[PDB]
Design a protein around this motif. Structure first.
Motif, short mmCIF file in Angstrom:
data_model
loop_
_atom_site.label_atom_id
_atom_site.label_comp_id
_atom_site.label_asym_id
_atom_site.label_seq_id
_atom_site.Cartn_x
_atom_site.Cartn_y
_atom_site.Cartn_z
N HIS A 179 -12.89 27.03 -6.23
CA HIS A 179 -11.79 26.59 -6.51
C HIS A 179 -10.78 26.11 -5.13
O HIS A 179 -10.37 25.23 -5.02
CB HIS A 179 -10.37 27.81 -6.57
CG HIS A 179 -10.50 27.84 -8.07
ND1 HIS A 179 -9.22 27.54 -8.93
CD2 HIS A 179 -10.74 27.97 -9.15
CE1 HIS A 179 -9.34 27.65 -9.97
NE2 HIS A 179 -10.21 27.21 -10.06
N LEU A 229 -6.48 6.53 1.13
CA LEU A 229 -5.86 6.22 2.51
C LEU A 229 -6.28 6.31 3.57
O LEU A 229 -5.20 6.03 4.43
CB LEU A 229 -4.29 7.46 2.21
CG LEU A 229 -3.83 7.24 0.73
CD1 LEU A 229 -2.74 8.63 0.48
CD2 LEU A 229 -3.29 6.23 0.94
N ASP A 281 -16.51 9.03 5.71
CA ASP A 281 -15.62 8.63 4.61
C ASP A 281 -15.87 7.15 3.93
O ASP A 281 -15.93 7.21 3.12
CB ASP A 281 -14.21 8.30 4.69
CG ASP A 281 -13.32 7.14 6.15
OD1 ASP A 281 -14.41 7.70 7.09
OD2 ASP A 281 -13.17 6.44 5.88
N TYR A 288 -11.00 13.18 -0.89
CA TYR A 288 -10.92 12.57 -1.20
C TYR A 288 -10.37 11.08 -1.00
O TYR A 288 -9.56 10.14 -1.21
CB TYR A 288 -11.36 12.54 -3.04
CG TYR A 288 -11.13 11.60 -3.78
CD1 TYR A 288 -11.89 10.51 -3.51
CD2 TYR A 288 -9.57 11.53 -5.00
CE1 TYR A 288 -11.58 9.57 -4.54
CE2 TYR A 288 -9.60 10.33 -5.78
CZ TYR A 288 -10.47 9.46 -4.71
OH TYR A 288 -9.72 8.35 -6.49
N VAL A 289 -8.61 12.34 -1.15
CA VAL A 289 -7.46 11.65 -0.72
C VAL A 289 -6.93 10.76 0.42
O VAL A 289 -6.47 9.22 -0.01
CB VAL A 289 -6.62 12.70 -1.27
CG1 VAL A 289 -5.09 12.50 -0.71
CG2 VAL A 289 -6.20 12.73 -2.32
N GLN A 333 -16.30 12.19 -9.37
CA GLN A 333 -16.29 12.35 -8.02
C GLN A 333 -16.81 12.88 -7.37
O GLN A 333 -16.93 12.81 -5.80
CB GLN A 333 -14.78 12.74 -8.55
CG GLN A 333 -13.72 12.75 -7.31
CD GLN A 333 -13.76 11.62 -6.40
OE1 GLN A 333 -12.52 10.26 -6.69
NE2 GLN A 333 -13.75 11.47 -5.05
N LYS A 382 0.78 -1.54 -0.01
CA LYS A 382 0.06 0.38 0.00
C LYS A 382 0.53 1.35 -0.44
O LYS A 382 0.77 2.50 -0.40
CB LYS A 382 -0.99 -0.03 1.07
CG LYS A 382 -1.98 1.40 1.19
CD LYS A 382 -1.87 1.95 2.65
CE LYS A 382 -2.25 1.70 3.72
NZ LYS A 382 -1.66 1.49 4.71
N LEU A 397 -9.69 9.99 2.04
CA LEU A 397 -10.75 8.22 2.08
C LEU A 397 -9.53 6.92 1.58
O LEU A 397 -10.13 5.93 1.84
CB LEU A 397 -11.37 8.77 1.30
CG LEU A 397 -12.55 7.71 0.90
CD1 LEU A 397 -12.93 6.70 2.36
CD2 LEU A 397 -14.00 7.84 -0.12
N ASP A 454 -18.86 12.49 -3.41
CA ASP A 454 -17.96 13.35 -2.66
C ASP A 454 -18.73 14.18 -1.76
O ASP A 454 -19.02 13.44 -0.42
CB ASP A 454 -16.94 14.70 -3.42
CG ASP A 454 -15.26 14.19 -3.45
OD1 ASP A 454 -14.55 13.35 -2.31
OD2 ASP A 454 -14.73 14.25 -3.99
N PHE A 511 -10.98 21.39 -1.45
CA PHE A 511 -11.00 20.76 0.56
C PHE A 511 -11.81 19.56 -0.05
O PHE A 511 -11.65 18.23 0.48
CB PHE A 511 -11.98 21.73 0.94
CG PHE A 511 -12.81 21.19 2.00
CD1 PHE A 511 -11.25 21.08 3.33
CD2 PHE A 511 -14.09 20.57 2.48
CE1 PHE A 511 -12.37 20.62 4.53
CE2 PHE A 511 -13.85 20.14 3.17
CZ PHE A 511 -13.43 19.47 4.41
N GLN A 512 -12.27 18.88 -1.43
CA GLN A 512 -12.64 17.83 -1.49
C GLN A 512 -12.15 17.38 -2.11
O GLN A 512 -12.09 15.74 -2.12
CB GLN A 512 -13.85 18.30 -3.08
CG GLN A 512 -15.51 18.71 -2.17
CD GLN A 512 -16.32 18.18 -1.76
OE1 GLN A 512 -15.90 18.61 -0.17
NE2 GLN A 512 -17.55 17.16 -1.26
N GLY A 513 -10.80 17.37 -3.43
CA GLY A 513 -9.95 16.68 -3.27
C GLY A 513 -9.20 15.86 -2.34
O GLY A 513 -8.97 14.63 -2.24
#
Lengths: 48, 44, 147, 44
Positions: free
Chosen positions: D28, D43, C105, D38-39, C92, A10, D41, C96, D33-35
């Motif tokens: 923006h 990980l 999450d 997601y990152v 996405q 991972k 989540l 989200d 913040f959403q990205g």
């Protein structure tokens, strides 16, 4: 003992994403500065 | 000349406010980058 | 989005220039000569006349970018010959929003409406909610320790 | 009155441009913040 191998895999798969995201944001401040540069020109024009 | 002086002062203060906002944004982006680097170091 | 920002900035600059003005106070010969002189062609010359695309993907394992070259004369991934290329979007924002709706999450512990919306929007995600072919967690690299 | 009308139109247009820039900055920041979420989540 498979947990160590799983976490190593991972980490190996996530290091590329992490440092790619880190390198993508390096030019972000420069992009913001160059996008806000026309605002300074507009302010100078208004002052003139 | 009072109105012109007031307009010049308003322009100067709005330019100063824009510069302060830009500096704050730069500081925030630098802090975010440093936090991301620290997170990467913690998971290195 | 970047193109829209650039065109808005160029329109702003054009209007500023107009206001300032109002109120103040072609390789055919080169190709022929190259063909006559070199008298030899390589596949890496026909694509030089058109803009190329570079998609690097580096990693910390080794300092070497993964350069990717895409054809410009075809409507492939990354090519720009007729309009907006493939962006891989609309997959996405919904996820989200579903994750942030309940501040959780994990989608497994979400509401029934969120699960139904995820199933409807993503047909390939309906095979995970039914809990078919059970497997411990999600470890694609299981062959090594399994063997 | 033409010069005054032009000045009023310029002020309105610049206010609209400032509002549009603020909305774009908010969009923006929300996207960033959403990205990041997601990152996180991915990980988790």
């Amino acid at each position: 003992d498979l947990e160590k191998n799983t976490l190593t895999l991972k980490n190996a798969a996530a290091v590329a994403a992490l440092d790619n995201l880190r390198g993508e944001t390096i030019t972000l401040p420069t992009e913001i500065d160059r996008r806000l540069k026309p605002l300074e020109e507009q302010l100078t024009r208004m002052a003139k | 000349l009072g109105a012109l002086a007031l307009l010049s002062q308003a322009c100067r203060r709005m330019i100063d406010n824009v510069r302060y906002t830009r500096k704050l944004l730069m500081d925030h982006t630098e802090d975010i980058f440093q936090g991301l680097g620290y997170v990467k170091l913690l998971l290195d | 989005a970047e193109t829209r920002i650039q065109e808005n900035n160029r329109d702003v600059l054009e209007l500023i220039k107009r206001a300032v003005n109002i109120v103040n106070s072609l390789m055919e010969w080169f190709d022929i000569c190259y063909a006559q002189l070199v008298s030899g062609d390589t596949p890496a010359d026909f694509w030089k006349r058109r803009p190329l695309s570079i998609v690097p993907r580096h990693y910390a394992e080794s300092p070497s970018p993964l350069i990717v070259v895409s054809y410009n004369g075809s409507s492939a991934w990354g090519g720009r010959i007729t309009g907006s290329p493939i962006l891989y979007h609309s997959a996405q924002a919904i996820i989200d929003a579903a994750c942030i709706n309940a501040r959780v999450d994990n989608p497994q512990s979400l509401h029934v409406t969120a699960r139904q919306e995820l199933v409807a929007r993503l047909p390939f995600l309906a095979n995970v909610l039914n809990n078919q072919t059970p497997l411990p967690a999600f470890k694609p690299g299981a062959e090594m320790f399994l063997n």
